[PDB]
Write a protein that binds this ligand. Structure first.
Ligand code: ZU7
Length: 435
């Protein structure tokens, strides 16, 4: 696999041992051949599990998830997918790695799609080798892959709201369940219903993931309520998965606003990874997977693939050349390579709006391409009245950096800035000039 000019997809089934058994053997062989190598983890939780699997090997951990200081003897670097893309965008030199390994290579966040595009382009150029590790590669149509032990698959109506009757099987269970919901707000309602019924519930989402995931190891629980972030290598000691089979889809409308459409069906890859949380113990057959809908190609026209092109158009490759998306996912967006390439100062604003501003890629691009500088927040208040952000059914208000109370009405509306209480609180702080 390690031969230059080749991309290998390591598609062993979930729980086959890609991370704990295969990855250390690849790393040893890469060090034996003096290959400068990068290992890309989807999250800090996976970065910490990888350190345990690679312990003793000379790996430089470029993440605060692992308490290990580098010694300079390392030619293998390990970082998150988002950190790789961030360092490529920033004015810092990233080594031209001979071997590029991406774990949980199915991740559809924009920075992970961009990282696959950049790496696969370097392989196409004949400059590098790559290994993408995932049971569910782009375009997979199999929601029921192999597992370490047999799973009981059952199609059943799954609640998406609080209930008083008709779903006794949910609460009659005496084991541990991982339940995938389409949004944080939907999980809050289901969690409250379960807590009122006497269950112990932990909730996971992208913004709370490292902190709350530790609770699944440190205390007893009956349910974990989680969004799709748990499809990325999160391991639980569970015997049942309840899967709504639904997700939200960010969609750009008329090139001028982003809505969160749905909930709508998940892809086959997501359904296989959600199911893949159980059936992992060869000595415990009969884990249950209850699923509440079918699968569909909901990654087609999904904003993340247009946002990955915005990132790739702004990464230096070679002169004016621009990296393409990885071939099996290149048709998910109608976009021309290079259409989002920004001039020097606008590119710097675009990067800072994402890195420090914590804005979605699409929204950071609208601001930067309009020639607005990072600290100028006048655009948060001068949009049309239909762009008014609401807080508990009344227009949201903030004190601007000038000390005036104003209604939040952004020039460009991206539903991701106000999709839950935490997102809206963060956007109000941004509008106020607090970061
Ligand atoms: O960049 C980091 C850590 N950094 C990652 C993402 N942002 C927050 C923390 N460490 C590093 C270690 C060794 C090196 F040689 C270079 C960088």
């Amino acid at each position: 696999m390690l031969k230059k000019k080749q991309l290998t997809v390591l598609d062993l089934h979930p729980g086959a041992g890609k991370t704990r058994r295969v990855l250390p053997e690849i790393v040893r062989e890469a060090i034996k051949k003096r290959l400068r190598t990068v290992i890309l983890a989807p999250t800090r939780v996976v970065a910490a599990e990888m350190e345990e699997a690679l312990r003793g090997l000379p790996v430089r951990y470029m993440t605060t998830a692992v308490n290990v200081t580098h010694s300079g003897t390392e030619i293998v670097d390990l970082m998150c997918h988002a950190t790789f893309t961030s360092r490529l965008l920033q004015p810092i030199r990233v080594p031209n790695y001979n071997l590029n390994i991406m774990d949980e290579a199915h991740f559809t966040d924009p920075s992970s799609i961009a990282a696959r595009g950049y790496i696969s382009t370097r392989v196409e150029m004949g400059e590098a080798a790559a290994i993408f590790m995932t049971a569910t590669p782009p375009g997979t149509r199999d929601a029921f892959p192999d597992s370490n032990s047999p799973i009981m698959d059952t199609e059943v109506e799954v609640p998406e709201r609080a209930w008083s009757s008709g779903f006794d099987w949910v609460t009659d269970h005496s084991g541990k369940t991982v339940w995938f919901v389409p949004s944080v707000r939907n999980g809050n309602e289901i969690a409250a219903c379960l807590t009122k019924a006497g269950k112990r519930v932990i909730q996971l989402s992208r913004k709370t993931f490292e902190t709350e995931f530790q609770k699944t190891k440190n205390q007893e629980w009956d349910f974990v309520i989680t969004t799709d972030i748990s499809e990325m290598g999160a391991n639980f000691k569970a015997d049942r998965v309840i899967d709504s089979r639904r997700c939200l889809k960010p969609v750009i409308l008329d090139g001028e606003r982003v809505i969160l459409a749905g909930p709508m069906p998940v892809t086959h890859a997501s359904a296989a990874q959600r199911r893949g949380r159980i059936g992992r113990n060869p000595n415990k057959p009969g884990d249950e997977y209850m699923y509440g809908g079918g699968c569909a190609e909901t990654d087609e026209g999904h904003a993340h693939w247009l946002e990955a092109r915005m990132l790739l158009d702004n990464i230096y490759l070679q002169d004016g050349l621009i990296a393409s998306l990885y071939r099996p996912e290149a048709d998910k967006v109608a976009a021309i390579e290079g259409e989002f390439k920004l001039r020097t100062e606008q590119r710097k604003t675009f990067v800072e709006l994402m890195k420090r501003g914590d804005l979605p890629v699409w929204l950071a691009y609208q601001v930067a391409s309009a020639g607005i500088t990072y600290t100028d927040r006048r655009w948060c208040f001068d949009g049309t009245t239909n762009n008014t952000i609401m807080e508990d059914s009344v227009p949201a208000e903030v004190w601007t950096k000038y000390g005036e109370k104003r209604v939040l009405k952004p020039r460009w509306m991206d539903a991701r800035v106000c999709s839950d209480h935490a997102a809206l609180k963060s956007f109000k702080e941004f509008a106020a000039g607090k970061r």
